[PDB]
Design a protein around this nucleic acid. Structure first.
Ligand SMILES: [K+]
Ligand SMILES: [K+]
Ligand SMILES: [Mg+2]
Ligand SMILES: [Mg+2]
Ligand SMILES: [Mg+2]
Ligand SMILES: [Mg+2]
Ligand SMILES: [Mg+2]
Ligand SMILES: [Mg+2]
Ligand SMILES: [Mg+2]
Ligand SMILES: [Mg+2]
Ligand SMILES: [Mg+2]
Ligand SMILES: [Mg+2]
Ligand SMILES: [Mg+2]
Ligand SMILES: [Mg+2]
Ligand SMILES: [Mg+2]
Ligand SMILES: [Mg+2]
Ligand SMILES: [Mg+2]
Ligand SMILES: [Mg+2]
Ligand SMILES: [Mg+2]
Ligand SMILES: [Mg+2]
Ligand SMILES: [Mg+2]
Ligand SMILES: [Mg+2]
Ligand SMILES: [Mg+2]
Ligand SMILES: [Mg+2]
Ligand SMILES: [Mg+2]
Ligand SMILES: [Mg+2]
Ligand SMILES: [Mg+2]
Ligand SMILES: [Mg+2]
Ligand SMILES: [Mg+2]
Ligand SMILES: [Mg+2]
Ligand SMILES: [Mg+2]
Ligand SMILES: [Mg+2]
Ligand SMILES: [Mg+2]
Ligand SMILES: [Mg+2]
Ligand SMILES: [Mg+2]
Ligand SMILES: [Mg+2]
Ligand SMILES: [Mg+2]
Ligand SMILES: [Mg+2]
Ligand SMILES: [Zn+2]
Lengths: 110, 154, 286, 51, 166
RNA sequence: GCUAAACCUAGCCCCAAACCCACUCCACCUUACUACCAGACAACCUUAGCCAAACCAUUUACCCAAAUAAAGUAUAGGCGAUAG
RNA sequence: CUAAGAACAGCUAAAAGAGCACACCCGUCUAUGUAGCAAAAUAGUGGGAAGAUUUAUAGGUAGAGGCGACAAACCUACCGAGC
RNA sequence: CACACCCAAUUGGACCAAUCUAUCACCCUAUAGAAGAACUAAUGUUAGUAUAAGUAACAUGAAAACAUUCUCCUCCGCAUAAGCCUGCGUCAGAUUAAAACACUGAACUGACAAUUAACAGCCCAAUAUCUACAAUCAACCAACAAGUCAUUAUUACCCUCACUGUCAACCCAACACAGGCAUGCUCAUAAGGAAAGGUUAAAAAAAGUAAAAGGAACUCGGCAAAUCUUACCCCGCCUGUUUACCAAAAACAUCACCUCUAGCAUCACCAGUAUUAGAGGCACCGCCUGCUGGCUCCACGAGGGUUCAGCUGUCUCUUACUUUUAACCAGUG
């Protein structure tokens, strides 16, 4: 089926600029208490999620240098250690992961 | 008409759906925290909770070993399930994993989410925190609670 | 590229017209524009109005105090003989005083029942800033006026207009100048009501005072006609009754508005400024 | 359908004109002062003391 | 081509009199040859039209459209330009005055169809224009109420005359 | 205000005049542009048709060496169209 | 059509223009597709598959014609006469 | 008050835009001359841009330290031949559209680098003179269609390893096209790969799976699907051949039969000679017949009809699920 007549711009504006087609304003945007960057109420902060992944990748790179190959997953717990720290009383019989960097403030030692 | 359907339609079929979740489940056990589309994380979350339930049955249980054998593609993670994850949640009866939403990826603007096993050694996620008890709204409700309890005592 | 100059030339003129519409130039005095001769434009001024003006007197009627002050400052910048030009202050005072007395004479004779305050407002309206300037701008008065700032301010324009009367008053006398006021200032209240020029407050209070002077009892307001009272578009005709005799009837959307209008109708009949009054006699005096 | 944008200009250097050229840039002023002058400290007080 | 929007930033006004009110700062900025449809760009430009500078950025930051990232980059460099070059005291004070998209120079390619047929595909480009005005955004026009409707209707009934007569 | 819109040369046309070009080295008729072995191979011969004749079948103008004139004349021709 | 080459599992059978059945060749039926992946394809189902078979290479026959197990087929994706 | 101022074709007038030229004119005009001399319309030509429409359609397996690993597919792969001719090697780039993406962005631009002969190709002194006996494991046996491979004598001659091909994700199809594409190996891989951009799980549409009881009642027709199934008629002997792209047949060809023509050589027939050759008809055989005609019949058929039994969603009467599509979000368009 082919158009019988050309649709005019006046008809087109009513369809293209209809409120349904228009982008809806979002009212769920709030500032992150930690860094001040913008975030949504039901979504984790992009800036705060990126810093965790940057630190996680470095930790996972240290794991690779200790395992030294695939199919070598340890059967014990893992502990991440930074400069200026010693294994805890509960951190006995676990795999200590050394990081040559100061412990991040948001990363609480447990 | 889809009433009562709980399982989603993913992959290239019912079998490919299992393999997609099996890869996510296997990748979740090895790393204890992965990022994946929200729908696939939510569908895999049920299998992640029940995998620990089979892990608490012990490696001496033949049925529990077969579930671990199938749902863990990499065979080095099977000893980890029965010796690390299962002992960790010994006191717990549920809520082994937490699922949180993350900003949509730039590739296709897909709804993304992160699923992790509780108690991992990875840096903590910026978990959503409720307002402190010292806020103005909480203080008015705290004062109301005290009077109701005090009047209840007398 | 098509050869031809006439089409290209014609298109440039059209573009210039569009440029004017998009970015209009600031207005300029007619004197600065080409084809201007101050001596010739002022001689035709008298003949256009059919008056025997005096060139020496009329040339001093358009000269303003502000223009003289600015012109002297121009010579100081160049250090440059003295000017003996006279401003229109002397002529404006003669014209303004004569015009008010001439208007008072005309209005008091036409409307003997109009109070002195009412006559004062009409003269203050016909000689007002808006009426005088409207008449002045359509008689080529602003074009001949020598002002410091263009366009001529309404206060400056009003003062220059009476100087033309002052120049006319001396040259032609009062009888000839009296027709000049009648033909240009009286004709400005033709399609205008009494209270549209003499704005008043609380006409009912003014009506009560007028009937006391004539020893007439206070009127009683009663509903003569009524329509759509319960709707948002009512019509009330309230009438004023003196000794059970109707003196005026006024319409209005509400009762208070209709009664106020009825008072205005009563005042117009007492003062003789109704619409039915005979028109001003502009025929030549006998 | 094979037409493409005329995006072909590339960055170049403006510091030096082409080499092996007899013409050289003529300079009317020097870049800086040949010998730096340091006015004595407190010369503002000397402004009042004209003598 | 036309590049008037760039020149609209180079106009300098005469110094204001002491009694004259403060003139709001106007900043004209644009990005040319964006590889995006102007029709799709219009929805993003219409969204932030009339908004504050910070409110506009928040809407664009969580919008999934590709132009949202492009427009946000234009607003950041326009906000920086206003303070750096246009003598604007507060960067947040700015609000969006004019925001529209325009057609850009487009390429033409051949899209192959079946049966040896073909169509002419164009690689569409667009321009984005934004104008910033210093000062709080004007309040939105309140919706017309019954009193406003009633007052206008009665005025129409009062302005009617007797037509086709004296 | 975007897309765009505008521009004056490049060169060309028709005449006059005068009769034009092609070896720097190397390669080029074999599968051209390929350094280097018994070949015998050799060129020349009415144009037709469309079209017009309201079909078509005889026929139907095509610079042949001086512009003009004789003259569209003598002649030719289904004595038709037309040719001359 | 000429020159000189190549290919055809397994099984039943027999010295077969034999049977089943891959590679391969063909295109019966149905469906998808109809500016399509495709100016004739796809999926399944089918006919042949040691022979008048299939196929690579080079050469020949040219439009008042060629070639043709005659379908007025084909002769470079409009052949009752190519471009 | 004004008054030439409401017909097709055609005909008669009076004016006239722009342009060039003669002479004027000098913010664009005058009088004349001349002519590529005036476009709301030819499925007009070229170019720009709309409409359909941001629609149809297109695309990237998962996690991750981006080391790697996992899931799945493999009817593919490797090499040569042919073709193509630097066409995912390095580096840099104001870079930036390959039908999405892209910073290292890269199958784009510029520069630089490269494929090394043993393989393959490029061969040979003359003159005479030689060469009946296949192949198939070649030995049996058995053939016809009769075949794919050889020298000697004399004379001349004893200098030596040049030249060219060598890459790739590649060719022919207007494209990075589900097509076309010779041979040697691998016959499931030791090689090569990715059907899903994300989401939702409406209709309609496509493919697939399952189904109570019935089992062709559906329908032009048991088409499709399921099952693995009998008996015939018509036509054509059979294998084979044809309308490349709507007809694969009952049509053509075909052994066999029959008719007609020809007594001969140096380019076809033929290096042949009436048991031959050519031009044709018919379509084996068998029976019957005239002096050419009619039946029967073996197998055979993606030919055209009919039928038993079975089978089944073809149907009574549809339903459920899965996949693609779909709808929504993002990119391209
Ligand atoms: K004819
Ligand atoms: K058949
Ligand atoms: Mg549901
Ligand atoms: Mg094609
Ligand atoms: Mg004819
Ligand atoms: Mg005819
Ligand atoms: Mg056979
Ligand atoms: Mg067979
Ligand atoms: Mg054939
Ligand atoms: Mg036939
Ligand atoms: Mg026929
Ligand atoms: Mg052809
Ligand atoms: Mg008439
Ligand atoms: Mg003319
Ligand atoms: Mg013309
Ligand atoms: Mg036109
Ligand atoms: Mg047209
Ligand atoms: Mg539509
Ligand atoms: Mg779609
Ligand atoms: Mg894919
Ligand atoms: Mg060799
Ligand atoms: Mg592999
Ligand atoms: Mg899907
Ligand atoms: Mg999709
Ligand atoms: Mg059933
Ligand atoms: Mg039936
Ligand atoms: Mg069937
Ligand atoms: Mg047959
Ligand atoms: Mg037989
Ligand atoms: Mg057959
Ligand atoms: Mg066909
Ligand atoms: Mg065929
Ligand atoms: Mg067919
Ligand atoms: Mg036959
Ligand atoms: Mg039947
Ligand atoms: Mg039956
Ligand atoms: Mg059901
Ligand atoms: Mg879309
Ligand atoms: Zn944050």
């Amino acid at each position: 089926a082919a158009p019988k007549n050309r649709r005019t711009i006046e008809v087109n504006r009513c369809r293209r600029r209809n409120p349904q087609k228009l982008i809806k304003v979002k009212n769920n945007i709030d500032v992150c208490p930690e860094c001040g960057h913008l975030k949504q109420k039901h979504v984790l902060c992009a800036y705060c999620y990126e810093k965790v992944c940057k630190e996680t990748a470095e930790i996972r790179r240290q794991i690779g240098k200790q395992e030294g190959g695939p199919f070598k997953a340890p059967t014990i717990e893992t502990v991440v250690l930074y400069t200026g720290e010693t294994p805890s009383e509960q951190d006995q019989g676990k795999r200590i992961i050394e990081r040559d960097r100061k412990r991040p403030s948001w990363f609480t030692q447990n | 008409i889809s009433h009562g359907r709980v399982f989603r339609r993913m992959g290239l079929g019912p079998e490919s759906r299992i393999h997609l979740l099996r890869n996510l489940l296997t990748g979740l056990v090895r790393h204890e925290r992965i990022e994946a589309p929200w729908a696939r994380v939510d569908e895999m979350r049920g299998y992640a909770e029940k995998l620990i339930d089979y892990g608490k049955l012990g490696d001496t249980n033949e049925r529990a070993m077969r579930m671990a054998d199938f749902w863990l593609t990499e065979k080095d993670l099977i000893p980890k399930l029965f010796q690390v994850l299962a002992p960790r949640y010994k006191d717990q009866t549920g809520g082994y994993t937490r699922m949180l939403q993350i900003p949509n990826r730039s590739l296709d603007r897909a709804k993304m989410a992160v699923i992790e096993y509780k108690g991992n050694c990875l840096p903590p996620l910026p978990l959503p925190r409720r307002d402190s008890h010292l806020t103005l709204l909480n203080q008015l409700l705290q004062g109301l609670r005290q009077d109701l309890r005090q009047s209840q005592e007398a | 590229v098509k050869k031809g100059f006439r089409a290209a030339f014609r298109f440039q003129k059209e573009l210039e017209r569009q440029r004017l519409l998009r970015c209009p130039p600031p207005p300029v005095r007619r004197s600065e524009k080409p084809n201007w001769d101050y001596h010739a434009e002022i001689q035709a001024f008298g003949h256009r109005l059919q008056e025997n003006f005096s060139l020496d007197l009329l040339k001093t009627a358009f000269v303003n105090s502000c223009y003289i002050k600015s012109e002297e400052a121009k010579r100081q910048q160049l250090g440059i003989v003295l000017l003996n030009l006279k401003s229109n202050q002397e002529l404006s005072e003669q014209g303004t005083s004569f015009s008010q007395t001439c208007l008072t004479q005309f209005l008091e004779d036409e409307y003997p029942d109009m109070p002195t305050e009412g006559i004062k407002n009409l003269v203050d309206f016909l000689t007002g800033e808006e009426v005088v300037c409207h008449v002045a701008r359509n008689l080529a008065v602003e074009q001949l006026t020598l002002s410091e700032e263009f366009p001529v301010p309404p206060a400056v324009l009003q003062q220059t207009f009476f100087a033309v009367i002052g120049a006319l008053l001396q040259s032609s006398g009062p009888e000839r100048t009296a027709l000049f006021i009648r033909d240009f200032l009286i004709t400005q209240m033709t399609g205008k009501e009494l209270f549209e020029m003499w704005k008043i407050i609380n006409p009912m209070g003014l009506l009560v005072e007028e009937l006391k002077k004539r020893n007439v009892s206070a009127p009683e307001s009663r509903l003569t006609r009524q329509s759509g009272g319960t709707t948002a578009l009512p019509l009330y005709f309230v009438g004023l009754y003196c000794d059970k005799k109707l003196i005026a009837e006024g319409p209005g959307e509400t009762v208070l508005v209709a009664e106020e209008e009825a008072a205005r109708v009563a005042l117009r009949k007492l003062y003789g400024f109704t619409e039915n009054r005979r028109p001003w006699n502009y025929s030549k005096p006998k | 359908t094979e037409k493409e944008f005329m995006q072909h200009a590339r960055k170049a250097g403006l510091v030096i004109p082409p080499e092996k050229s007899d013409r050289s840039i003529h300079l009317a002023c020097t870049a800086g002062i040949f010998d730096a002058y340091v006015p004595p400290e407190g010369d503002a007080r000397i402004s009042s003391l004209s003598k | 081509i036309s590049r008037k929007w760039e020149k609209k930033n180079k106009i300098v006004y005469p110094p204001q009199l002491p009694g004259e009110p403060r003139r709001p700062a106007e900043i004209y900025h644009c990005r040319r040859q964006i590889k995006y449809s102007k029709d799709k760009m219009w929805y993003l430009a219409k969204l932030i039209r009339g908004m504050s500078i910070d409110q506009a950025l928040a809407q664009l930051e969580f919008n999934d459209k590709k132009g949202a990232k492009i427009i946000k980059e234009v607003l950041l460099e326009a906000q920086d330009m206003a303070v750096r070059d246009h003598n604007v005291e507060f960067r947040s004070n700015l609000y969006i005055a004019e925001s529209t998209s325009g057609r850009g120079q487009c390429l033409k390619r051949i899209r192959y169809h079946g049966r040896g047929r073909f169509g002419i595909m164009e690689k569409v480009y667009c321009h984005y224009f934004v104008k910033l005005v210093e000062g709080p955004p004007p309040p939105p026009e309140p919706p017309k109420t019954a009193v406003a409707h009633a007052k206008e209707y009665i005025q129409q009934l009062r302005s009617r005359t007797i037509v086709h007569t004296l």
